Amino acid sequence: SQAVVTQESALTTSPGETVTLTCRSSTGAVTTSNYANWVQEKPDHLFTGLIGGTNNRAPGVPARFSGSLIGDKAALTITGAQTEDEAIYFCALWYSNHWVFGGGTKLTVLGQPKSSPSVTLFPPSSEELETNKATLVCTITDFYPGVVTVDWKVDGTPVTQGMETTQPSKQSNNKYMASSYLTLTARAWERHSSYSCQVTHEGHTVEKSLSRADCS
Amino acid sequence: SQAVVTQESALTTSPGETVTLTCRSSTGAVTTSNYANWVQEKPDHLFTGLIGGTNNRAPGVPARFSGSLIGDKAALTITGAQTEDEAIYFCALWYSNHWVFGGGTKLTVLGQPKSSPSVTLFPPSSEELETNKATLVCTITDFYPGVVTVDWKVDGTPVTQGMETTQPSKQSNNKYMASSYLTLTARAWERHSSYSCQVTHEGHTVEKSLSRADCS
Amino acid sequence: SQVQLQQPGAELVKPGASVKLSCKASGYTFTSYWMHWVKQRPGRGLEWIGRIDPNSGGTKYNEKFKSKATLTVDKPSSTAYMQLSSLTSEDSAVYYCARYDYYGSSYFDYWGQGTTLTVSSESQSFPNVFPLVSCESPLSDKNLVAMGCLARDFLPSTISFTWNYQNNTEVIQGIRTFPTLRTGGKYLATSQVLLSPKSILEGSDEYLVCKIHYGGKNRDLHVPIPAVAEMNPNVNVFVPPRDGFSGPAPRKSKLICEATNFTPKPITVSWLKDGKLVESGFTTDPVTIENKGSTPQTYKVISTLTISEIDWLNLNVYTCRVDHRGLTFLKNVSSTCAASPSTDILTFTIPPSFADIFLSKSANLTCLVSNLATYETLNISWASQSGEPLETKIKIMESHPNGTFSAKGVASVCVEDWNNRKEFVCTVTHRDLPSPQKKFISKPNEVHKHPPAVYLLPPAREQLNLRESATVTCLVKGFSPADISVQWLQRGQLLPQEKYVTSAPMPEPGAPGFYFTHSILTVTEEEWNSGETYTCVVGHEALPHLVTERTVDKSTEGEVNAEEEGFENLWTTASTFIVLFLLSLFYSTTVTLFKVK
Amino acid sequence: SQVQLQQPGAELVKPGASVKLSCKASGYTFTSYWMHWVKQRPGRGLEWIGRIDPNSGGTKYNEKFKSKATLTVDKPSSTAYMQLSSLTSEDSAVYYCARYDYYGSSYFDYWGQGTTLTVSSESQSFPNVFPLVSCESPLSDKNLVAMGCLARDFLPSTISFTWNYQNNTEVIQGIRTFPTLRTGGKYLATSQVLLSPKSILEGSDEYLVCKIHYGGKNRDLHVPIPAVAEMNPNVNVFVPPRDGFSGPAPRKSKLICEATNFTPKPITVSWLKDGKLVESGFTTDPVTIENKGSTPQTYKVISTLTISEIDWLNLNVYTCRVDHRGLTFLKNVSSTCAASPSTDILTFTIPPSFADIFLSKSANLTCLVSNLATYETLNISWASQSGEPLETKIKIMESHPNGTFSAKGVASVCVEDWNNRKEFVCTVTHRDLPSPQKKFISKPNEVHKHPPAVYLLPPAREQLNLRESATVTCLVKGFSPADISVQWLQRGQLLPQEKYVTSAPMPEPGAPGFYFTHSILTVTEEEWNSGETYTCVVGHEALPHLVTERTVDKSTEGEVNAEEEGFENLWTTASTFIVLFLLSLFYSTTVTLFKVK
Amino acid sequence: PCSQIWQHPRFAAKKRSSMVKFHCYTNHSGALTWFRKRGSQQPQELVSEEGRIVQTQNGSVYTLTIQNIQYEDNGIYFCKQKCDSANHNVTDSCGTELLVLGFSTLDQLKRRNTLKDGIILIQTLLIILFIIVPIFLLLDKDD
Amino acid sequence: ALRVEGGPPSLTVNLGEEARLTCENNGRNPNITWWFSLQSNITWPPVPLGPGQGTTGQLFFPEVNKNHRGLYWCQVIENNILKRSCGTYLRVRNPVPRPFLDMGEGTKNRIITAEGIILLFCAVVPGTLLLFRKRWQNEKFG
User: Fold this and answer.
1) Which subunits count as partners of chain B given 3+ CB pairs below 8 Å?
2) Are D353 and D285 within one domain?
3) Are F130 and D588 inside 8 Å of each other by CB?
4) I need a surface site. Which of A169, C48, D56, D83 has the fewest CB within 10 A?
5) What domains are defined for chain A?
6) How many independent structural domains does chain C possess?
7) With an 8 Å Cβ cutoff, is E94 touching chain F?
8) Rg of chain E's alpha carbons, rounded to an integer?
């Protein structure tokens, strides 16, 4: 059995407190031999190495980042929560003379208040139905916390064939953007006439329904 | 002065007689030291060496080909005139320790009777006149004897600017094909309205005239 | 000098082939650091392939990727390659490289920017574009339009989206690019642009173009922009002429319901032949452009229906049904195919009859116009010489067999005005008449007057002998005005005009200017047999009291004499005289015998 | 097959470097034969560069090409090669290599296929194709359409021409690749295809596709097909309806001149308003496509003219002048130009009269036809319902003042058949009659036919009381035929119409279809004293004796009544008895006097 | 309040034993009494007789009909009514003055009158003669 | 609240002789009118005549004609109070103009009977005279 590093899922903070990221091993304890490293994964594909080597520093790293070894876990004490710290970190150690990584933890920094999400369903045109294909796009914008995806409920019955959800991305104006796709057939478009996009953002149910006769 | 081998221009024969090709030198006489050679130039770019070395033979050469030295000229006695012998031959000898060639002689084997030539003039379209260019093509097909000449006469006055003639080629059905090109300007097309292609095949004058208003 | 790295972008490597990447590093001493390779999947975590020390050496690889490890590191080139052989289906990931300072704090410095590497057995296909326009119509200025071009399939996740207007201008405020999504085959991404109706209706940009820089080949995609409606169509239905019938026999089948005010191109045009919808037999012309350069966007569509001549003369009213945003516009025409060249110039004024004059005590003037080809411009107005306005009754008679029409104007005026020979003017302005026509009606000049002499003749005995029926006739003779009304009464009850006839007045022989007439009251023999009293009344202007009456019955000896004769005294004298004759004769005989003795 | 000399195809080396070719040889011992090079220029003969002996040595060169080694044929797989140095403008030729057997008979055996090498000082461009379609319309099935694509500006690299249809099918036989020709540093060639019209109109292929093989890239090309030369155009002009001049409709009504079925593209459509040419006020719509399909078809053009309402009521005639190759079509709309009936040739049937039947004992059937323009081609004959021909007599009167002639048809047949109601038809045909005018006739509806019942009526005593005049009236009633002739007789002489008058026949109430008449003979008072003979006679068709007459004359016809004359006879006998008594008294008195005297 | 009686052709020149229809149209309902007047004598009550005086009541209308009319029926006919309105306000009709016509054909009367004039002239002559006869005869008789 | 004398129900007048009507009423001086009509209900409305003359409201026809037969009823208005009369009836008869022979049927027939009686008696008495004479002359001769 190899080394399996299990980190956290999602952590929330606020500008004014102190967030501490822990990393628990599986094979044994984390002492001064495991060179603890923390690599920040920025959304623009620009990695930056912050605390690399427990007590070892690095040029360009602010003084608000510090790394300690509380018992047997690598603690990352961050005094503050700025707008440029909301990213994904990793826990790199040393086992079997090689580097061991794992699933990163997405840190969420709740700063600006929430707003109202924009729901807009794009029905397929006539050029796509010629190839016996159909795809509906429901773009979801204006939202800091990406909410769970919802089933494309057609005629009051959710479907499972072709139900995927893309990963949120960091856009401009300190916001995020996402969308959804529903690959269907052209034979079901002429029979059905009820397509909605139910979006649940912290209890707020925003649904924009439409009909077939409303287009043409 | 180097060795200039002067051969013949065009020779005609018929299946049933005997054609003899001669080769006269210029520096001196042709004895047994000049290794007389005869290379056949087939239209499909497939050379074949027939009689190579006066009395010397070659595998694959029929017995109807023979080479003698009558006086001081290399005579090539060919007993017969098949359909595969109509090509161009050469006279290769030996002077100054190197091979000396020259202009080949095109042999014509009159076998099948003549027919009626097809004259079709192709006027330029509107896509060519946009670049201030004009080119007329008069394809000449259905003829054993190569087209003699393509005389272009516009408004009863022949022109000399841009008057060329391509070389005939051996196509299928034991026939030949040729064409002509007349590069003109777009300013002269709107003023002139008389373009013909006069073809004279052994006295038969075939002219296909056309007008400008007949197109559009 | 800032330390920067150079890594390849999108690389299409077949799985039957190996992938060779690179890692260019500059700006520092390349002969003093190590080199690592971090593998990041799209959905998993970070990995570690292996390391290699360029100066000297002595390194190992991971336990999972012990083979397939290539790290040709060229000291002078300062670039670390990485050849991966035997590519499977789980090698589609993004690799990176950084700098490891072993002789300084053991940490990381700068990193890469991205290396797209998708190992797929498929080949390179052309990405197809699909416009996606929402069906939400802008109701006000707050509603925005959201459109976008969908990219169905693309190997290199790196794809841009450019939006140019009617002209070559790039949108600055519209920078939206959604990441790709692996849906089994190739990828699927889109890009939406949020605009405003204030910058669309005020410009000439009728459609946008979303282009894709896929290897330098840009594809144009005309994305239309929806508009609004609120416009009524102009339905114009034309009729075939009377001489257009192609062919010697009346044959023709062409019409043009023209309708151009239709903003939505899909317009439903149908034909209803007497309520029945026409299934087939009509041609619909394609939608073209009516006007160009103007501000509103208008089109033009003309529908042609092929019918026959026999179905047109049967009074078949067609209807060009035009559907525009649910509204149904109907139009009914007149399938009449009769020319109207018949129109003369002669209009007459008729005084009212005596019967109506006495019945209503109000005369009715008449403005009789005839030979009218058309009646849509007909207007009859009545007035007096002084110009006093008056109401005019307008009624149209049945059309004459030749095709000509007629009309009369009725105006109610007092009889005293007619007695005072008052003049009245009827003004008619018709399209067939070159000029308005002015005419006057008044009482005729003074003429000799004579009241009628009524005479009631009883049926002849010979007529009664056939015991079939009786015709009671009253002769009315000697009246100058022809306006005379003669009626008959039964027991004082009016008799219908279907039971008797009255000959029109005919000039009196032997006396010019005087008129006479008859009236025959045909009565069944049973009715006349009951001693009925039959009378005829004669209403006439010249009469001193405007009406008289004459009587006759079975008596036929209805002389008026009160009581003169027939008394019993006549019988008394007859008897006393018989006695007187007897006594006188007896006395004479006795005288003779006494002469004898 | 068998091993063959492999030579490179075509190369492109800029003037300044060195071109490297190859002469691959396999199938024999390479270390036992020599190698030569033959330079053939397009337009000249053969040349000789040099040779090389792989066995012993001695690389000899030519006196003209001495400084150029080329040669250097020393590589693995006995690969024979060459390298030309200092490329000029006269080195554009084709080289070949063969095998020389020095130890045999010094002859030739195997050769190559060709190596295109043209030294050009230009870069790499893109060949542009141009379609060439002859201007010969297929008049029949013998005329074959000759179409081809022309390639210009293409560097020598062994190109080809393929002809693919819509279903992606390559032509088996028909592709003719003409050799290239150089002009001024540039080449060019065409490729025509010979097909037939029977395999073009019967298929869905509307255009040919001519591609090229220039570096592995393809390019499509559209080829058009001409149409027919010139057909016959049609002119169809419609008129607006009556309800076209409504209100909200813009420009009131419009005029549309549909002129379809027209091949030539230039067409001049103008409007003439009462002879004057309209300058502006019309919108000429662009010519579109009428029906889809193949190419030899027609188009469609729609005209539009803006008119008004005031000018429409002025009886204006429009004309849609369509200048089609000089031909002008004048169409007078809003006019009864054609399809307008007129007087025609009126055929009338006259039933025979009874007068000549009574006198001549025969009946004449008359077929009177008027309004005849000409008579030299007229054919009029009598016939029957069963097709039996009749003897027809032709009689022609003098010319009518209106310019029309007339004709008649006279036939004589037994009266009894006419009394049996046999249908006889008169056949009328003429050069001006599109169809014959066959009038079907028989006996007009016979009716009850009752004879008159004359009832002479005496004058009224009230009228006689005036002592001025009396009217004698004889009512004639109860006859079916309209015709009737009442005459009055005085002492056996006919009374002229100057003294008496009679009423026209009128229907009698109580019996539809039954007629009656009347009469009145004014007489003076002394005429009525004299007791003249007043009698009126009646002539009628239904009278069994053909004449009837009633007699009420003198001064009194008598009248019986009730016991009203009883006391009249009582008074008469009383007067008689007073007379007798007076006589007896006188006799007694005279006797007494005579006895006394 | 009881004076709305109607009547019919008043003069009614008729031949002996002829037929006309009388009625008593009124806008009231009460006791009725037919009356007959001749000349200047007092009103008298009429007595019903079948086939000579027909009396049918058509509701508010009292139809009457007189057959076998003779000269004694010449006069004035009207129908009375009783108005017991606490004031004895008795109202009546207006009248119908019937006349009987002599039939001398308006012409024989002249002949008869001329004849009687002849006879009474004959009276004058004969009476003078028969008054002069007795005295002139007794003068001769007595002599 | 008022009444009016009906007048004669009928009237007779010679042709060419004046005929005067009458309307007697209890009023002081009320509005008077003459409404001519015919015997039966004829579709024509009643024909109003002139206004009459005098306080009574008497008509006047200086030369009446045969056409003047019919009813002549007078209309009285007394302070917005209406009341209808009964109506006279004009008619001509042209009586006998021969008064020589002792006018009166009964008169002439009675003197005719007296003619018979007196003539018979005054003829009989001469017979008695004659027989007396004959007897006396016969006595004289003897």
Assistant:
1) D
2) no
3) no
4) D56
5) 10-109 (2.60.40.10), 118-207 (2.60.40.10)
6) 5
7) yes
8) 27
